[PDB]
Subunit: 115 residues, 4 copies
Amino acid sequence: CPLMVKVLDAVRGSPAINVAMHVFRKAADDTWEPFASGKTSESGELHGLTTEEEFVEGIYKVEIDTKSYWKALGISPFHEHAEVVFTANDSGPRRYTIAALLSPYSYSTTAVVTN
Amino acid sequence: CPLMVKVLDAVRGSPAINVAMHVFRKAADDTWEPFASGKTSESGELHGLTTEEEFVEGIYKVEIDTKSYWKALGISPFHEHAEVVFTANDSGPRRYTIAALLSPYSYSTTAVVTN
Amino acid sequence: CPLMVKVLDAVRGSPAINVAMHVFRKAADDTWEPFASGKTSESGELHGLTTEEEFVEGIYKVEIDTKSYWKALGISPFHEHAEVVFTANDSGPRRYTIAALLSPYSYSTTAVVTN
Amino acid sequence: CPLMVKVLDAVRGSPAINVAMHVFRKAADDTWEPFASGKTSESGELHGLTTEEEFVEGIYKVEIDTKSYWKALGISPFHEHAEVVFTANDSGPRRYTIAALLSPYSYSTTAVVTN
Ligand SMILES: O=C(O)c1cc(Cl)c2oc3ccccc3c(=O)c2c1
Ligand SMILES: O=C(O)c1cc(Cl)c2oc3ccccc3c(=O)c2c1
Ligand SMILES: [Ca+2]
Ligand SMILES: [Ca+2]
Ligand SMILES: [Ca+2]
Ligand SMILES: [Ca+2]
């Protein structure tokens, strides 16, 4: 699988478990069509979203439901969700790991792209 | 000035100057309506986007054109744009400062909210 | 004001107020000599630490007492302090703004350096 | 092994390979004594620094040589090193993963503590 998402909780110092997210692919009319989705595991990771053959070049959006995560912990957050929008680019063999580090009023997102 | 956006460049250690961004507000039909737009100044800040009267309760999206910023510096970055989606003014008027810290393969977005 | 430090709280979305910090400068014998100290204001900023004449070339360390900040809010954080170590003024005088973004189990430190 | 360190490069979107670091433990006289050291692997990770029996409660410092990493890439950095200072605390079974996300003028450090 060429795309994995990892989510971490900066308040508790833990993987962020049971975080829902949807992946969309941008269509020719500039709309977002659903592509894949799931929830993070006990390790904070979501594997198996797609396959090499399906994950073609294009613009993708990962929408991570961070608000529901914080609400379950009883903490008021700022963001409605965390958004990661990127172009997949074929330059040799590539695997994408997207990490989201979550705080109630801040998040960071990083891509590690490896061969 | 109930909404201000500040953008910083983590490669150069500088304000990110001339960064374009568009603000949208979610309409009753769930579409994103244009709300305001502008570019960061030499200080990396964009002031004057809206007014207290115009900045009603709602869900807002700030799309910061980080890709064009990096490309003009000779860097091909990961993200298409940095996106910040948030509910504003749900408990009455607040002042929002959104800061985006940019690197080619990572960014963070933080909000300081004051009454 | 060639050195300013700003501290933000990513849990509350606010300036981090009354945060103590100590600045040290490396002496010729490799020990850390006291240089300046202070606490952040209601804006989360600490101004006036030094002057252009006093802030000579050297290696400086800013130790920000993040642990006491979190403990007073009822949180037991991971880090003892946030540490920022840097060479200053190696190519002539510069102005340094150091920002620390704090969460209980994570922090970031960023510098904006201007001529 | 109860302590692992992972280092990521936010400019290239990659693990930060061959990054040297030293771990110190604070002594009773407030000096830092060497405890362990190594360099990150091709995955950006440094494993095997210590053992359960050796890693007792106390204050530890991880000093990551980020300046040498950026210098090898020909990029001028801000920090002399990245410093992570924390107290190890016995509260049930615990494994510490310290992640450092590096940019030339900014870094973030996060602890994920798991059972
Ligand atoms: O007000 C400033 O001059 C200033 C300078 C720096 Cl380095 C800053 O870095 C940051 C890094 C992460 C999140 C927010 C900020 C800031 O809000 C910020 C503001
Ligand atoms: O592989 C891990 O266990 C692990 C642990 C931590 Cl704390 C991590 O923090 C991070 C903080 C910012 C950006 C990426 C990561 C990680 O990719 C990451 C991975
Ligand atoms: Ca291509
Ligand atoms: Ca309301
Ligand atoms: Ca010099
Ligand atoms: Ca104990």
